[PDB]
């Protein structure tokens, strides 16, 4: 089990017609949780939010309407038609299938930015400031200043640029960086598809 294993499991999230299958997506996320946890990081507390959300999508896929949660496209279609999404404010659907995936989608965005910033960096780069750039380019818009100003402090508990690279269990840093340019574009496709879908239906601002 390593980071390459995870990043190429996303290959399975996109069917032959470019739909995003739920079951692999969840499975791929159970791995990302697993990898987050393997780091001796303060940021393992957010893995309870992920697992929480992953269990949301697991009950929907397991419920009486399993078939509509086969894919994100199916899910969006079903939930928008049946009016099961709080488009305006949270009211009766605070745990919509749509908005839940939206949070993991945004999280998926910070990941590829950081992994890229990890890949295309000087070998003496501050990982705290790598993260801050990635964070401010993704999640920061959706977080209150209190969360913003504090999560920055916690970016300092982060290991070094090397320390991240061997943590992936692929070998020396220079061979982590090589696999990073090869295992990445699987998650980038899933993101891009999911991004397009959520944007076709004006769903990038679900509360
Ligand atoms: C070599 C890199 C290793 C990292 C691998 C991580 C793989 C799994 C993904 C990690 C990044 C996901 C972080 C969480 C994303 C936040 C999304 C979010 O907006 N959550 C919110 C949902 O709220 P609600 O809608 O009301 O239920 C929630 O309010 C916020 C919770 C978490 C806030 C903390 C912000 C995260 C800061 C940046 C992440 C740093 C990750 C640490 C690096 C290991």
Curated annotation (Swiss-Prot):
<feature type="binding site">
    <location>
        <position position="143"/>
    </location>
    <ligand>
        <name>an N-acylsphingoid base 1-phosphate</name>
    </ligand>
</feature>
<dbReference type="GO" id="GO:0005829">
    <property type="term" value="C:cytosol"/>
</dbReference>
<dbReference type="GO" id="GO:0005640">
    <property type="term" value="C:nuclear outer membrane"/>
</dbReference>
<comment type="similarity">
    <text>Belongs to the GLTP family.</text>
</comment>
<dbReference type="InterPro" id="IPR036497">
    <property type="entry name" value="GLTP_sf"/>
</dbReference>
<dbReference type="GO" id="GO:0005543">
    <property type="term" value="F:phospholipid binding"/>
</dbReference>
<dbReference type="GO" id="GO:0032691">
    <property type="term" value="P:negative regulation of interleukin-1 beta production"/>
</dbReference>
<feature type="binding site">
    <location>
        <position position="103"/>
    </location>
    <ligand>
        <name>an N-acylsphingoid base 1-phosphate</name>
    </ligand>
</feature>
<feature type="binding site">
    <location>
        <position position="49"/>
    </location>
    <ligand>
        <name>an N-acylsphingoid base 1-phosphate</name>
    </ligand>
</feature>
<keyword id="KW-0472">Membrane</keyword>
<keyword id="KW-0963">Cytoplasm</keyword>
<dbReference type="InterPro" id="IPR014830">
    <property type="entry name" value="Glycolipid_transfer_prot_dom"/>
</dbReference>
<feature type="binding site">
    <location>
        <position position="53"/>
    </location>
    <ligand>
        <name>an N-acylsphingoid base 1-phosphate</name>
    </ligand>
</feature>
<dbReference type="GO" id="GO:1902388">
    <property type="term" value="F:ceramide 1-phosphate transfer activity"/>
</dbReference>
<dbReference type="GO" id="GO:0005886">
    <property type="term" value="C:plasma membrane"/>
</dbReference>
<keyword id="KW-0446">Lipid-binding</keyword>
<dbReference type="GO" id="GO:0005794">
    <property type="term" value="C:Golgi apparatus"/>
</dbReference>
<keyword id="KW-0333">Golgi apparatus</keyword>
<protein>
    <recommendedName>
        <fullName>Ceramide-1-phosphate transfer protein</fullName>
    </recommendedName>
</protein>
<dbReference type="GO" id="GO:1902387">
    <property type="term" value="F:ceramide 1-phosphate binding"/>
</dbReference>
<keyword id="KW-0539">Nucleus</keyword>
<keyword id="KW-0445">Lipid transport</keyword>
<dbReference type="GO" id="GO:1900226">
    <property type="term" value="P:negative regulation of NLRP3 inflammasome complex assembly"/>
</dbReference>
<comment type="function">
    <text>Mediates the intracellular transfer of ceramide-1-phosphate (C1P) between organelle membranes and the cell membrane. Required for normal structure of the Golgi stacks. Can bind phosphoceramides with a variety of aliphatic chains, but has a preference for lipids with saturated C16:0 or monounsaturated C18:1 aliphatic chains, and is inefficient with phosphoceramides containing lignoceryl (C24:0). Plays a role in the regulation of the cellular levels of ceramide-1-phosphate, and thereby contributes to the regulation of phospholipase PLA2G4A activity and the release of arachidonic acid.</text>
</comment>
<dbReference type="GO" id="GO:0010507">
    <property type="term" value="P:negative regulation of autophagy"/>
</dbReference>
<dbReference type="GO" id="GO:0120009">
    <property type="term" value="P:intermembrane lipid transfer"/>
</dbReference>
<dbReference type="Pfam" id="PF08718">
    <property type="entry name" value="GLTP"/>
</dbReference>
<dbReference type="GO" id="GO:0035627">
    <property type="term" value="P:ceramide transport"/>
</dbReference>
<keyword id="KW-0813">Transport</keyword>
<keyword id="KW-0967">Endosome</keyword>
<feature type="binding site">
    <location>
        <position position="99"/>
    </location>
    <ligand>
        <name>an N-acylsphingoid base 1-phosphate</name>
    </ligand>
</feature>
<keyword id="KW-1003">Cell membrane</keyword>
<dbReference type="GO" id="GO:1902389">
    <property type="term" value="P:ceramide 1-phosphate transport"/>
</dbReference>
<dbReference type="GO" id="GO:0010008">
    <property type="term" value="C:endosome membrane"/>
</dbReference>
């Amino acid at each position: 089990f390593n980071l390459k294993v995870v990043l190429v499991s996303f290959k399975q999230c996109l069917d032959e017609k470019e739909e995003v299958l739920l079951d692999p997506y969840i499975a791929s996320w159970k791995g990302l949780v697993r990898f987050l946890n393997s780091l001796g990081t303060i940021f393992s507390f957010i893995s309870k939010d992920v697992v929480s959300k992953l269990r949301i999508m697991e009950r929907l896929r397991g419920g009486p309407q399993s078939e509509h949660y086969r894919s994100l496209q199916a899910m969006v279609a079903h939930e928008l038609s049946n009016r099961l999404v709080d488009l305006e404010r949270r009211s009766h659907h605070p745990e919509s299938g749509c908005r839940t995936v939206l949070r993991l989608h945004r999280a998926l965005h910070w990941l590829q930015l950081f992994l890229e910033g990890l890949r295309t960096s000087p070998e003496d780069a501050r990982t705290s400031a790598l993260c801050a750039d990635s964070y401010n380019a993704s999640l920061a818009a959706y977080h209150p200043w209190v969360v913003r100003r504090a999560v920055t402090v916690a970016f300092c508990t982060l290991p070094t640029r090397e320390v991240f690279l061997e943590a992936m269990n692929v070998g020396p840093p220079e061979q982590a960086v090589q696999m990073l340019g090869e295992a990445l574009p699987f998650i980038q496709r899933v993101y891009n598809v999911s991004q397009k879908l959520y944007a076709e239906h004006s769903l990038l601002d679900l509360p």
